[PDB]
Structures are given as C-alpha cells and as structure tokens.
Design a protein around this ligand. Structure first.
Ligand SMILES: NC(=O)c1ccc[n+]([C@@H]2O[C@H](COP(=O)([O-])OP(=O)(O)OC[C@H]3O[C@@H](n4cnc5c(N)ncnc54)[C@H](OP(=O)(O)O)[C@@H]3O)[C@@H](O)[C@H]2O)c1
Ligand SMILES: NC(=O)c1ccc[n+]([C@@H]2O[C@H](COP(=O)([O-])OP(=O)(O)OC[C@H]3O[C@@H](n4cnc5c(N)ncnc54)[C@H](OP(=O)(O)O)[C@@H]3O)[C@@H](O)[C@H]2O)c1
Lengths: 195, 195
C-alpha cells in the first residue's frame, strides 16, 4: 500500500483556487489568482524543498496540464515532478509528451495504484480529484499552508467530497510572513463528548 | 472606537456549530455536537482563561440564550461574562433577568456601540451575527482555535457575510491535543501577484 499525501495552499476560509497567479484558474471569473504571492518567503521556500522530494504523483487532469505547461522546462528547481511517474485522472487525455505520465479513468484505477508498490504518492492542486479521494477515504495525510487572507468566492479544498473524519496533528510551524504550516494524519472516527 | 474581537472554535473545514455538546445546536439534525470535547487539556485551559478576561460582549440572541441558561450560575469560572455588559442582537427579545444585558436591533446600533466609549468587545459563538459583522468589516481581530477533524455539515464562521480581506497573524500556538490557536488582526485589501 502507498501513502497518498494531499498538499494544499488554502486561505483562512478554505479557498484553494489559483494560488500562484492571476490567470492560473479563472473559473467563475475568480479575481484573486496569485493570493499566495505576497506571502512567499525564504523559510517557506525551505519547507517547500522538503516537500519537493522525488516521489510519485496523483493529479487531476487540469492540474496536470497546468503543470505540463511549465515544469518540464524547470526540471532543475523541481526534479521530482519530472522524474517521478505522474498518474493523471482523465477521460479526455490518454497521452502526453511529458515523460512518465500514466492516465487513469476510474476510481478502481486509483485504488489499485494505492495497493501497488512504489514511492508514496503526492497530490498537488487537483481539488476536483481530491473530492473523489476524500469521499472514498483514500487520503492518508494532509499538508496545509494557511494564509492570512479571506476570499469568499473560489474552489475549496474541503468541498462536496469531504466526510466526517478525525485527524492527528503531526507537525506545525509559522512563517515570518504569517502562514501556518500544518500537517495531519488520518485518525479514525469523529469523537464527541460534553465539555 | 472599541475593538471588536471574534473568538471562534472551528473544524478544519470551518464548521463551528455546537462545539460543546451533543444538544448545544441540533439545527439540521447535526449529529456531531460536542466535537470539541475530545481536545480539552490543562494547557488549553490556561490558554483560554486569559482569553476570558473581563470585557464587554456582543452576541446573537441564540448564543446569548445558550449562555444565559448556564453562566449566571457559574460566575465562579467566568466572571467576565457576568460582570461585563452583554449587547445582544435581537428583534424578538427585549429583556433578560441576566443582569447587564442590553438588546440592540440594527446595524446602526452595532455601529453606535462601536463608536461609543467603553471597554473592548468580545464576540463568542454567534455565527449568524458574525456574518453581519464580517460583511460590514466591523471585525478588528480574530482569535481562532482549529481542531483536527472535518465534519462536512454544520454552520460555519466564514459564511454568507465573508468578504475578501487580508489579516496579520498576531500570534500562533499549538496544543498537546493538536489544536492550533491563531490570533489575527485585520490588515487591509487582499494583495495579488505572481509567484
Ligand atoms: N491551493 C493549491 O495548493 C493549488 C495548487 C495548484 C493548483 N491549484 C488549483 O486546483 C485547481 C485545479 O483545477 P480543478 O480542481 O478544477 O480540476 P482537477 O482536479 O485538477 O482536474 C480536473 C479533471 O481531472 C479529472 N477528474 C478529476 N476528478 C474526477 C472525477 N471524480 N471523476 C472523473 N474525472 C475526474 C477529470 O479529467 P477529464 O475532464 O480529462 O476527464 C477532471 O475534469 C485549480 O484551481 C488550481 O489553480 C491549487
Ligand atoms: N465555535 C464557537 O466558538 C461557538 C461557541 C459558542 C456557540 N457556537 C455556536 O454558534 C451558534 C449560535 O447560533 P446562531 O449562529 O445560529 O445564532 P446567533 O448568531 O447566536 O443568534 C441568532 C439571533 O440573533 C439575531 N441576529 C443574528 N444576526 C442578525 C442579523 N444579521 N440581523 C438581525 N438579527 C440578527 C437574531 O435574533 P432574533 O431572532 O431574536 O431577532 C437571530 O435570530 C450555535 O451553533 C453555537 O453552538 C459556537
């Protein structure tokens, strides 16, 4: 079995759409592409490089295409994404010029990929795919960066796939710019008492 | 001008309905009342006894009535809620036997309270009222506690009144149970750029 880690940049109110630039995702006329920009720091970069260790990848087709437009030409900065096998969920695209690209069509394919052998799987972006993962409880770890801004509109990490589920805080840090690094692990059912 | 601080317990996906008990808020058949109970420890008790220092209070009617059923008899534990003035937003309640309770009816009345001279203001619970405060940018500070669960259902802090806005992280902390404490201050317009 493989460890599927979802990594995600979110606002205070959970919005994940277009973190890196004004045209990254204009669905809905989203006006706030690039909201992570004013919060990029040195410390933040060091955290990123630890998360940019080579591994395998599971991506939604849109996130894969966004990546394919940029990252093959910058294999220096992020080698793992070029070197590791990228598993892409799509009914639309069955081939890519990007090296190490395998295309999956159904939930069963994702599951077999989990029950396979190989490097642990990272999931970046891919909010729509993440909803299917959450709904079938296939995500084992969550690495969030939480940014000191609120934007009502936008695609959300915790969307229509989210399920009642408990987590364990594995690690937390704070950047100088005010971003909170919080990594969690799945921990069984939700507990309620009376305070 | 008075400072308005919103204090709020939320899940990872932003839910804040019924932290304290199975029956605190059964709206929608909400099954997870009490989800905050398993994350209670000593050091969190010290964290939030100083968060409960004497102030004035602005509350929605439902939160006020939840409080009024319990706290008048536990002024031992939280004397601030009893001694401070509780400004309550309601169009259906004009009086309470809980002493030092004034009932306001309008946005104009909240604005007048903010302008008027007196102690700083704490908002607890009051998700619906908080929506009106957010939409009118009347919230000066946000003290949050984030819990390692997702619930999918239930009322949320960032709801219909949430507006685009940036914040400064005043301070942060973790809890042995895995709860992040994050205190933010309002800091102007959302800035965008390119990474
Ligand atoms: N905050 C962050 O960390 C971060 C980082 C990078 C990107 N992002 C943002 O993430 C978003 C990515 O776009 P997106 O989430 O809307 O789409 P996506 O998940 O990246 O990919 C969408 C495509 O993947 C396939 N797919 C995904 N789920 C499927 C399902 N349950 N059943 C069948 N096919 C499924 C489908 O491909 P086919 O149509 O080909 O069949 C679907 O159209 C963007 O907003 C991006 O800016 C966020
Ligand atoms: N996570 C936490 O920190 C925390 C702590 C405590 C409680 N809570 C939860 O907070 C929730 C409180 O219930 P709630 O948010 O639904 O209601 P609420 O905000 O506490 O009070 C609702 C009532 O206040 C008045 N009101 C609120 N907004 C108004 C507006 N914009 N205009 C006019 N009147 C307004 C109305 O009173 P009238 O109907 O009389 O006109 C409204 O019915 C509960 O779920 C509670 O469990 C959370």
């Amino acid at each position: 079995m493989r460890k599927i880690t979802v990594l995600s940049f979110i606002t205070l109110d959970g919005v994940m759409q277009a973190p890196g630039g004004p045209e990254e995702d204009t669905s809905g006329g989203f006006k706030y592409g690039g909201w992570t920009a004013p919060y990029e720091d040195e410390v933040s970069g060091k955290i990123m490089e630890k998360q940019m260790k080579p591994a395998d990848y599971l991506l939604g087709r849109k996130t894969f295409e966004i990546f394919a437009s940029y990252w093959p030409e910058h294999a220096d900065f992020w080698p793992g994404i070029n070197d590791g096998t990228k598993y892409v969920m799509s009914k639309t695209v069955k081939k890519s010029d990007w090296k190490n690209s395998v295309f999956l069509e159904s939930l069963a394919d994702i599951k077999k990929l989990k029950n396979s052998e190989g490097s642990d799987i990272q999931v970046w972006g891919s909010g729509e795919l993440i909803q299917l993962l959450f709904k079938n409880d296939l995500v084992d770890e969550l690495w969030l960066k939480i940014f000191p801004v609120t934007l009502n509109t936008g695609k959300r990490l915790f969307g229509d796939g989210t399920i009642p589920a408990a987590f364990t805080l594995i690690e937390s840090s704070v950047t100088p710019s005010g971003v909170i690094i919080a990594n969690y692990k799945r921990a069984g059912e939700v507990k309620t008492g009376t305070v």
